[PDB]
Amino acid sequence: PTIFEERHLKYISQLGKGNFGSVELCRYDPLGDNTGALVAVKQLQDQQRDFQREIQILKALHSDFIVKYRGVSYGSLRLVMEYLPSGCLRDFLQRHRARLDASRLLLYSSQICKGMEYLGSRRCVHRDLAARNILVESEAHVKIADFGLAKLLPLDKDYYVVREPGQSPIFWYAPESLSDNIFSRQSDVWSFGVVLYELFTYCDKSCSPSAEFLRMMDVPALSRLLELLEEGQRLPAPPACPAEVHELMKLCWAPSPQDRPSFSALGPQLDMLWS
Numbered sequence: 001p002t003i004f005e006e007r008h009l010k011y012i013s014q015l016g017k018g019n020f021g022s023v024e025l026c027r028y029d030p031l032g033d034n035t036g037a038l039v040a041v042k043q044l045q046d047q048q049r050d051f052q053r054e055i056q057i058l059k060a061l062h063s064d065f066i067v068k069y070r071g072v073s074y075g076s077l078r079l080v081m082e083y084l085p086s087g088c089l090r091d092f093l094q095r096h097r098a099r100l101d102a103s104r105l106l107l108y109s110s111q112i113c114k115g116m117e118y119l120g121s122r123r124c125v126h127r128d129l130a131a132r133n134i135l136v137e138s139e140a141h142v143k144i145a146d147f148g149l150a151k152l153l154p155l156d157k158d159y160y161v162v163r164e165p166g167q168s169p170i171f172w173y174a175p176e177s178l179s180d181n182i183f184s185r186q187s188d189v190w191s192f193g194v195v196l197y198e199l200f201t202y203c204d205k206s207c208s209p210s211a212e213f214l215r216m217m218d219v220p221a222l223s224r225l226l227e228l229l230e231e232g233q234r235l236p237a238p239p240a241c242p243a244e245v246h247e248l249m250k251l252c253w254a255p256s257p258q259d260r261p262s263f264s265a266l267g268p269q270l271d272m273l274w275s
């Protein structure tokens, strides 16, 4: 059931890209009559090693808040996952902003936090937590996706040091990630603070992390952002944001990783704000 034959996967369209790969919508149609199930299929476009690691990570994750691994097709050639037609949260928020209230945003925040608490329990660092990497199962259910940059922490080391600087938009990176290429479950907490900001602005482009940080900012942009952050400057409270939600973002944005709340400490606080 977890082995998908290449010849039966029928290409339909492109779903997206990210981290030198692509996601396609395919029908797994062994009958050849267009009645088979729709699946989301990820493939590559040393890269093979990081793709194999991603598959092994996702295959061992079992959560209502993490995108479901279905299987693999060999040539490992492709990663097969459940298809979520509503797509990424970032685009969903922009389209349905006039229908989703603060209660719904708090529900999504709590579900992402629960998925992140579970990833941390698995010693998994996501490294790319952003609304563009969160999928919408339904109007009341979100799931974390894209484990392309994810790392498993060894048993005796609670952080990870990357050899070369990242290729992701710099606006979600923690100061220790921007300065020393250090990543941990605490830098995932920083990124979650940016996710909370994204939810509460409904991913509005005009006040996005990139537009707002550029606005606030011969020195490179990365060094200028680090300077901004080291001074204690932070993204402003989104328009109409409840005061308590903004206070949580600021806690996620503590200068030192050790002072940031844990996902287990954040969870009951978001659950309390939701109700």
Ligand SMILES: C[C@]1(NC#N)CCc2ccc(-c3ncnc4[nH]ccc34)cc21
Binding pocket: 015, 016, 017, 018, 023, 040, 042, 067, 081, 082, 083, 084, 085, 087, 088, 132, 133, 134, 135, 145, 146, 147
């Ligand atoms: C998060 C991200 N990369 C990945 N993995 C970034 C670009 C993109 C575009 C489409 C989808 C997608 N859409 C619908 N159902 C799905 N199931 C699994 C993935 C998926 C996911 C992604």
